[PDB]
Coordinates of C-alpha atoms in Angstrom, one line a residue:
X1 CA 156.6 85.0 176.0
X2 CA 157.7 82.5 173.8
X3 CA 160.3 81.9 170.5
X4 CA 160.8 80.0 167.8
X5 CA 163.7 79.3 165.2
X6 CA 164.5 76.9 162.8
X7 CA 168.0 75.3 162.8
X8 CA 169.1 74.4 159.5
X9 CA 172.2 71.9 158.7
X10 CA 175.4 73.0 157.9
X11 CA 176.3 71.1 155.8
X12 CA 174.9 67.6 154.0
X13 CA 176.3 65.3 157.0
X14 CA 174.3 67.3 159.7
X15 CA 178.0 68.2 161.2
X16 CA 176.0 70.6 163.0
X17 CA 172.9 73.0 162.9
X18 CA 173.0 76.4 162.9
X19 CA 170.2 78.6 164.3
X20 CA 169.8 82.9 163.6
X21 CA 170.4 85.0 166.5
X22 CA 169.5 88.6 166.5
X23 CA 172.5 90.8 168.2
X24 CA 172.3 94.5 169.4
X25 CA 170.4 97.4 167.8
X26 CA 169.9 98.0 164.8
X27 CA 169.7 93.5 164.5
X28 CA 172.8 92.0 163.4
X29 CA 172.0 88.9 162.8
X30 CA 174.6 85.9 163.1
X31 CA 174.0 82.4 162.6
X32 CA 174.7 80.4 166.1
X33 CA 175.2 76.8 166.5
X34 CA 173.3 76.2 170.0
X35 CA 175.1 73.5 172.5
X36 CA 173.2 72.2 175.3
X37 CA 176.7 71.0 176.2
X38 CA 178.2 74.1 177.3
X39 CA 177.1 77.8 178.7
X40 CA 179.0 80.4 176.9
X41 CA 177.1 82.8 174.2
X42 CA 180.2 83.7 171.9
X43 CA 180.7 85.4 168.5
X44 CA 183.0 86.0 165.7
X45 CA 183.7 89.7 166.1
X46 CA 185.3 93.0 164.7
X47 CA 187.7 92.1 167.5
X48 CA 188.1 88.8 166.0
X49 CA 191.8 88.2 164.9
X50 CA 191.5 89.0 161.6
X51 CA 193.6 85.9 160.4
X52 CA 191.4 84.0 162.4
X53 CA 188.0 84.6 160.6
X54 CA 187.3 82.8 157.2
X55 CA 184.1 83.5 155.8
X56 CA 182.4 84.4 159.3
X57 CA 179.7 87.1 159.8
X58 CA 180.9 89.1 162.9
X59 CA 179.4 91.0 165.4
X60 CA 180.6 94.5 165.8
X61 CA 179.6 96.1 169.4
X62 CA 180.4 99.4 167.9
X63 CA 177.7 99.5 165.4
X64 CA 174.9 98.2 168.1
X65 CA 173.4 101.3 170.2
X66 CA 172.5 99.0 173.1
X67 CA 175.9 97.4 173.0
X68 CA 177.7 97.7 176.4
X69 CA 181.2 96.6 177.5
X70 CA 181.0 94.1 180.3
X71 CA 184.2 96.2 182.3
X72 CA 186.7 93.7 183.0
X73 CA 185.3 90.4 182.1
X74 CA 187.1 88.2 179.9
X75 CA 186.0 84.5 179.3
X76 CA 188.5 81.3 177.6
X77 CA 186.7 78.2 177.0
X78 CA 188.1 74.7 175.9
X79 CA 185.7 72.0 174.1
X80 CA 185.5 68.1 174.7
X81 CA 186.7 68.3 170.4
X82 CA 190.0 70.1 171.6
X83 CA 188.6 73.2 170.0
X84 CA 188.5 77.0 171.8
X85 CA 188.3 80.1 172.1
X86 CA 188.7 83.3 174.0
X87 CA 188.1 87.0 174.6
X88 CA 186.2 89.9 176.0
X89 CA 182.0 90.6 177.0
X90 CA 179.5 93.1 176.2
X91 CA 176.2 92.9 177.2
X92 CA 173.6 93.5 174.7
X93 CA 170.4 93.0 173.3
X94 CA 169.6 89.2 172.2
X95 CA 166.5 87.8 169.8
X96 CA 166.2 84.1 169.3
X97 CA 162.8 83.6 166.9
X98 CA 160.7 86.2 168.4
X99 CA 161.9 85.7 172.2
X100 CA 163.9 89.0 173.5
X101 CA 166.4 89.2 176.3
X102 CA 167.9 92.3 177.3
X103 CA 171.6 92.3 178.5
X104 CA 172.3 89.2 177.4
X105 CA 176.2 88.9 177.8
X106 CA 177.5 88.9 174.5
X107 CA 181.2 87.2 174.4
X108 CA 183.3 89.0 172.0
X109 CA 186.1 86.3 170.4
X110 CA 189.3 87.7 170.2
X111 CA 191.0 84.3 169.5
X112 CA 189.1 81.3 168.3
X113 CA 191.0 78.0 167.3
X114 CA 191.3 76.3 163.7
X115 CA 188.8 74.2 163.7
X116 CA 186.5 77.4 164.3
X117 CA 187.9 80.0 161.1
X118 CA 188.1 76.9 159.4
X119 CA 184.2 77.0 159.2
X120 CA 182.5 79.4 157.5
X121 CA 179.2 78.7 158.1
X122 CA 179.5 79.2 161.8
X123 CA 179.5 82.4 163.5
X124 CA 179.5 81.2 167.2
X125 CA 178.0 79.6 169.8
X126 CA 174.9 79.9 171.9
X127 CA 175.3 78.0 175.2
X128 CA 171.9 76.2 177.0
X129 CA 173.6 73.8 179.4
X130 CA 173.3 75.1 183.2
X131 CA 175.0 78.7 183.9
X132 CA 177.2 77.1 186.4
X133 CA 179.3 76.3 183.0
X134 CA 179.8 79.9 182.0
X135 CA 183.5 80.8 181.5
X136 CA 183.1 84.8 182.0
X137 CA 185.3 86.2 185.0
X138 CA 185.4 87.5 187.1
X139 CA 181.7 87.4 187.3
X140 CA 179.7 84.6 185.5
X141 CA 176.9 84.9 183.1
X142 CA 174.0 83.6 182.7
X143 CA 172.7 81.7 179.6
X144 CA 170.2 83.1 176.4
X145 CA 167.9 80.8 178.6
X146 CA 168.3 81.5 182.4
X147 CA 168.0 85.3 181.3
X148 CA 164.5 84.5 179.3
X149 CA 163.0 82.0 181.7
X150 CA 161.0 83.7 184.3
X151 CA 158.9 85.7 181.3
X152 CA 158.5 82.8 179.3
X153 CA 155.1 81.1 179.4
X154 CA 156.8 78.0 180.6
X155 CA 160.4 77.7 181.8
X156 CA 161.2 75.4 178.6
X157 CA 163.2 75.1 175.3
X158 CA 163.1 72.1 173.2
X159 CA 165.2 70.9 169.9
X160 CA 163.8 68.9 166.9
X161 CA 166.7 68.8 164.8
X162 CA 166.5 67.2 161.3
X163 CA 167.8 64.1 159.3
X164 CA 169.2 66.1 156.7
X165 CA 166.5 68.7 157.0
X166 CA 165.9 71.8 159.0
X167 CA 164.2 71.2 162.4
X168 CA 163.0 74.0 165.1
X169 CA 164.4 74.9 168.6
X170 CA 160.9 76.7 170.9
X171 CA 161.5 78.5 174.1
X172 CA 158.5 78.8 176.3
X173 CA 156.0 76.3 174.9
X174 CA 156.0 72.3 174.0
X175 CA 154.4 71.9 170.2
X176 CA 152.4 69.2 170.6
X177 CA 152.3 68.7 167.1
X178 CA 155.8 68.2 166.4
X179 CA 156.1 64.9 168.0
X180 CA 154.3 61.1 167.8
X181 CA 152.9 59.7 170.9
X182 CA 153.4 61.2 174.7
X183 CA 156.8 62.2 175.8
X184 CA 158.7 60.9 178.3
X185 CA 160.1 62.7 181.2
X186 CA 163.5 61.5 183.3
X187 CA 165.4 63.0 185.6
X188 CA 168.3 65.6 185.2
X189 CA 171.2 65.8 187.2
X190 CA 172.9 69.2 187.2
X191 CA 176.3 68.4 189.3
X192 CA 178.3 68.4 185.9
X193 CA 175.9 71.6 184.9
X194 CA 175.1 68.5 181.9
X195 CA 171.4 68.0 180.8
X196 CA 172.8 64.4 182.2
X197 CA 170.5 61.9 182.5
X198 CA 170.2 57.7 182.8
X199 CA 169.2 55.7 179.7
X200 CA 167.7 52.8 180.5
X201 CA 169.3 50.3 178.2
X202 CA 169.6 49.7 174.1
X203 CA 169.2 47.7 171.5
X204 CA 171.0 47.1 168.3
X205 CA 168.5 47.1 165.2
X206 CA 165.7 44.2 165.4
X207 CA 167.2 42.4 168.8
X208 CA 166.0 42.1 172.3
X209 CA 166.5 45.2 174.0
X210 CA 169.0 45.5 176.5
X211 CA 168.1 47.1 180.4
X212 CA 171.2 48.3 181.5
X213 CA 171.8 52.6 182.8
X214 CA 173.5 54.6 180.7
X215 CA 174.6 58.0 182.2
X216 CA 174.9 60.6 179.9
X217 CA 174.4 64.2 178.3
X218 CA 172.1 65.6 175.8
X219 CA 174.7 67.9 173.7
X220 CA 173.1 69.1 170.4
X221 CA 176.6 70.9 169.8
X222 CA 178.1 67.0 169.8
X223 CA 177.5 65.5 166.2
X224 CA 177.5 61.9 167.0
X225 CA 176.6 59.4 170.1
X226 CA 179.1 58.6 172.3
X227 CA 178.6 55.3 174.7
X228 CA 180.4 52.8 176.4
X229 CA 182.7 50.7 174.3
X230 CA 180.8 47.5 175.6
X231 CA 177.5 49.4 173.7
X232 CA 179.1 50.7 170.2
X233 CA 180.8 47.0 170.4
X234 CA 177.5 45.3 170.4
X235 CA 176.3 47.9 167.4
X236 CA 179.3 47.5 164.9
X237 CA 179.3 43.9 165.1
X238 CA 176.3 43.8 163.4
X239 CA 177.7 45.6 160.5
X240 CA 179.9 43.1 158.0
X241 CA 183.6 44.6 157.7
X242 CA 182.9 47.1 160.2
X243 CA 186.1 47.7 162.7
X244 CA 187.7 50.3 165.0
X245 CA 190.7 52.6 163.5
X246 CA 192.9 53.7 165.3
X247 CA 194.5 55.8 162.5
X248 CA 190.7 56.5 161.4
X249 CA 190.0 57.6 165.3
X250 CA 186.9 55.4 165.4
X251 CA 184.2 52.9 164.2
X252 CA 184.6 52.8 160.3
X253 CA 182.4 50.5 158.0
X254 CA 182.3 49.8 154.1
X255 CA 179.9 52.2 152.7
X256 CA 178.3 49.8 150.9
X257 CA 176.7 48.4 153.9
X258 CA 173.0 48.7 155.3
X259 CA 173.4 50.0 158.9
X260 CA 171.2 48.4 161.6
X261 CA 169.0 50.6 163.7
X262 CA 169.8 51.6 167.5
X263 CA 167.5 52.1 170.0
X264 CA 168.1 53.7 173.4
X265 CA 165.8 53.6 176.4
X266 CA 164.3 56.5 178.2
X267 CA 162.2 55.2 181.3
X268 CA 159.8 52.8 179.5
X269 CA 160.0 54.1 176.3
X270 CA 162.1 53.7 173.5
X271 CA 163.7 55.6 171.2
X272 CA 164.6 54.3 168.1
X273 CA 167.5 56.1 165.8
X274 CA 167.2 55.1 162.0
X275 CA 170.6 53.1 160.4
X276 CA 171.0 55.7 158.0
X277 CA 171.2 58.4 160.5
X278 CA 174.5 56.6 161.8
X279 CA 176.3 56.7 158.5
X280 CA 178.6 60.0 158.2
X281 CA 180.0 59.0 154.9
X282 CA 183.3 58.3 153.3
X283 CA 186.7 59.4 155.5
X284 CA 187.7 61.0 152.9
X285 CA 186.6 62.4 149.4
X286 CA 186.2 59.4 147.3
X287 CA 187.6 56.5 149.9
X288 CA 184.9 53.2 150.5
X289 CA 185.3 53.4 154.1
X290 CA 182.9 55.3 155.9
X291 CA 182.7 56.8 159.1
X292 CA 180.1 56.0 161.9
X293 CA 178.2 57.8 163.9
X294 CA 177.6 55.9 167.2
X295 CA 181.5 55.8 168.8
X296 CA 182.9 55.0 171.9
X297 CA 183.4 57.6 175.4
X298 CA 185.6 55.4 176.2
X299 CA 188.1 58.0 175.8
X300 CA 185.7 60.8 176.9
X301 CA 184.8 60.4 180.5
X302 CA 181.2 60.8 179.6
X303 CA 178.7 59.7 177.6
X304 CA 177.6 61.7 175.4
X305 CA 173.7 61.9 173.3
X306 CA 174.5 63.8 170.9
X307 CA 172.9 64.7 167.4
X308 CA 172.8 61.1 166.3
X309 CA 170.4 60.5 169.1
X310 CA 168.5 63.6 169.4
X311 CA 167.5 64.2 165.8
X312 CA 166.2 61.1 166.4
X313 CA 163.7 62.8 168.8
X314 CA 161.2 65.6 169.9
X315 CA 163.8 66.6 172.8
X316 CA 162.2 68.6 175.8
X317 CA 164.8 70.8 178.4
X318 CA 162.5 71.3 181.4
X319 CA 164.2 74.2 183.3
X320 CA 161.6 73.8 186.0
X321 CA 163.2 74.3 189.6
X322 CA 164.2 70.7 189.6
X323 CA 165.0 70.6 186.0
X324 CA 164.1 67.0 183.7
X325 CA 164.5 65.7 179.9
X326 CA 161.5 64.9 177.9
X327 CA 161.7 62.5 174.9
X328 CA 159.0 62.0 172.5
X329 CA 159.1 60.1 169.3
X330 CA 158.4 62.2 166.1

C-alpha cells in the first residue's frame, strides 16, 4: 500500500504545515501538523477542555463506530517550545492520503497548553519520530508509521514541504519526480528515538564551504534551523545590522536586508537553503526588525533541522531495519 497528502501552510510565514488525517468511522477528518520530532498521535477532542479549544475541529470517539477506549492509558507530553499537553487514548481507525491503519492509538487531549488553543488552525499532532518516544502508559504506542510499515510497498515516508506553498508527505513510495538530481542517503541514529543524523559541514551564501559534523534532527514540527552558535555566528555576520536579542530571543536583522543563502552538507552533497527562506518577518506588526530563521541550539541541547532546512529539500525517512535519511535537492 501506499499514501499521499498534501501539507499546506498555516499561515504566510510557514509557522507550520498542516496535513488532513481521517479519524474513526464515519471519517472525521482533522487537520494534523506531522512532527518527525516526537511520537504521539494527539487531537483536540470533545473531551477537550472546553476553555481550552479556540477555533479547533475536535474529534469525538463517541460519534466514531470503530472508536475504542484504550482502558487505562493516559499519555502527558512536553515540547522542546515549552508547549504540552495531556489526556486519555482510544484506538481507532486512521487515513493519511489513501494509506489505512486500523487501531491506530488515538490520544484524546483533555488539557493542551496556550500556545495550542491559541491556534486555530491546528487540530493536533501526528508523531513520525521512533515509537520509543511515545508518551502512552502504561503501555506505549506505536506511531501512524510503525503501525503502516510492514503493508506498505516500502517501509518509507518522505516530506517535501513548501516555501510558502503546499508540499506533499508519501508513505510507501519515493516520487522520483519530486526531486532534482539523486538523493543522498546518511546514517540515522535512533538512541535519542531522533531521525538524528551528521551534517557534514556549511556554508554561508557564496563562501567556501565549511567540513565540519553537525549532529542533529530532522523535525518538520520545528519551524526554524537550530545550530551551534559558532554556525548561526558565521551566518548573521554576513547580514549588515544583524545582532542577537536577548529581549527578541534570537538573531534579528533589518528587514530591509537581502539575506545570504546557507548551505548544509549531507555526505558529499549539498544542500543549499534559499536567503529568503530564512526571513520570518517583522517581530511585531509593523516593527523594521525582523526575525531569523537560522538560530542558535545553544540553549537546546540539540541541533535541530527543522523546516528552514527541510523545505529546502526532497526529505526521505528510510524506516528500513537499520533506518537512514535521504536528501535530494528539488
Amino acid at each position: 500500500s501506499t499514501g499521499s497528502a498534501t501539507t499546506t501552510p498555516i499561515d504566510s510565514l510557514d509557522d507550520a504545515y498542516i496535513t488532513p488525517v481521517q479519524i474513526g468511522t464515519p471519517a472525521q477528518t482533522l487537520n494534523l501538523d506531522f512532527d518527525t520530532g516526537s511520537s504521539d498521535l494527539w487531537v483536540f477532542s470533545s473531551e477537550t477542555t472546553a476553555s481550552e479549544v479556540d477555533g479547533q475541529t475536535i474529534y469525538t470517539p463517541s460519534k466514531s463506530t470503530t472508536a475504542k477506549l484504550l482502558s487505562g492509558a493516559t499519555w502527558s507530553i512536553s515540547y522542546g517550545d515549552g508547549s504540552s499537553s495531556s489526556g486519555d487514548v482510544y484506538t481507532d481507525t486512521v487515513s493519511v492520503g489513501g494509506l489505512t491503519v486500523t487501531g491506530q492509538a488515538v490520544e484524546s487531549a483533555k488539557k493542551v497548553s496556550s500556545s495550542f488553543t491559541e491556534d486555530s488552525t491546528i487540530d493536533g499532532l501526528l508523531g513520525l519520530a521512533f515509537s520509543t518516544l511515545n508518551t502512552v502508559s502504561p503501555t506505549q504506542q506505536k506511531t501512524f508509521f510503525d503501525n503502516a510499515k510492514a503493508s506498505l510497498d516500502s517501509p518509507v515516508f518522505t516530506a517535501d514541504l513548501g516555501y510558502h506553498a503546499p508540499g506533499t508527505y508519501n508513505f510507501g513510495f519515493i516520487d522520483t519526480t519530486a526531486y532534482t538530481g539523486s538523493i543522498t542517503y546518511t546514517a540515522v541514529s535512533t538512541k535519542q528515538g531522533f531521525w538524528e543524523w551528521t551534517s557534514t559541514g556549511y556554508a554561508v551564501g557564496s563562501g567556501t564551504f565549511k567540513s565540519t559534523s553537525i549532529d542533529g534532527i530532522a523535525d518538520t514540527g520545528t519551524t526554524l534551523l537550530y545550530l551551534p552558535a559558532t554556525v548561526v555566528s558565521a551566518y548573521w555576520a554576513q547580514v549588515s545590522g544583524a545582532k542577537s536579542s536577548s529581549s527578541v530571543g534570537g538573531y534579528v536583522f533589518p528587514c530591509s536586508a537581502t539575506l545570504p543563502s546557507f548551505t548544509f552538507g549531507v555526505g558529499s552533497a549539498r544542500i543549499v537553503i534559499p536567503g529568503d527562506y530564512i526571513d520570518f518577518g517583522p517581530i511585531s506588526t509593523g516593527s523594521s526588525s525582523c526575525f531569523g530563521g537560522i538560530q542558535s541550539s545553544a540553549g537546546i541541547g540539540i541541533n535541530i533541522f527543522g523546516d528552514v532546512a527541510l523545505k529546502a529539500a526532497f526529505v526521505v525517512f528510510n524506516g528500513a531495519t537499520t533506518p537512514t535519511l535521504g536528501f535530494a535537492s528539488k
